[PDB]
Design a binder for this molecule. Sequence first.
Ligand SMILES: Nc1nc(-c2ccc3[nH]c(=O)[nH]c3c2)cs1
Lengths: 9, 272
Amino acid sequence: RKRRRHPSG
Amino acid sequence: LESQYQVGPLLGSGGFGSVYSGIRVSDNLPVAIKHVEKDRISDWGELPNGTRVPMEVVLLKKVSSGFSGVIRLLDWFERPDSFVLILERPEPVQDLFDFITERGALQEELARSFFWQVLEAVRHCHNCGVLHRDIKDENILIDLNRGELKLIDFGSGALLKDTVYTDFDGTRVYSPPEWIRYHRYHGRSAAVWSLGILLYDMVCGDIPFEHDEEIIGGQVFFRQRVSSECQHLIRWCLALRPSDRPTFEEIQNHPWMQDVLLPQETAEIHLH
Ligand SMILES: Nc1nc(-c2ccc3[nH]c(=O)[nH]c3c2)cs1
């Protein structure tokens, strides 16, 4: 299953 | 400015800026060197000098006194179109997002040690008047030799207050349902929600929610074997009603949180 980073700022 | 530090390779870039590995020549100390473009800076603050600086600099100075689980601001400089921040650099280091990617779901003993240290770091920020607003595994470094965790990137933070916040630039999948539904939140209870997301992330190997509808749905499905006591703490942190979430004191007094490992034991048992 796809695990990913998530952006912010 | 360019004579006090030797500049190494990019460690990364993103919503925070561009961050470089570096070395302080005065004593070969490892540092991280972060550049922020003035045109991208949303919130500005001021310090005692009345000098106008990015809020991130204000918050780092307030939490950088003494030792703690926060990466300390060692110096900063203003340039024509940017600010440059000199930050601590642990070595050797891995951020908690990559650590969970490579190792999968963490053993509860190890999640307990990490989560406890994150709670102590966040309490420190709150003691100093600082709300981080972007607690997540990506914003946590692991010093792999000392077994200590360090909080980074205050670029979405704010001064801590007791009245409502109506702005937010942190990570949406860690933001609470009252933000999703009404664009309002209070600081501590929103922080507790993101700590619930983080704890689930640690013991299950990825975050529970990706979509707004899951965030506001209030259903936590456990995809790994997790003890009933840990499930209870997570579900409490993720109560839909903010007033139903635990305080930091209730989290740390929770039965799942007892008998934490020391940082050095954590390094020797799980990281060396
Ligand atoms: N992989 C590594 N990243 C750092 C680091 C240190 C401090 C930071 N503050 C930020 O906003 N980003 C940062 C990154 C040190 S070793």
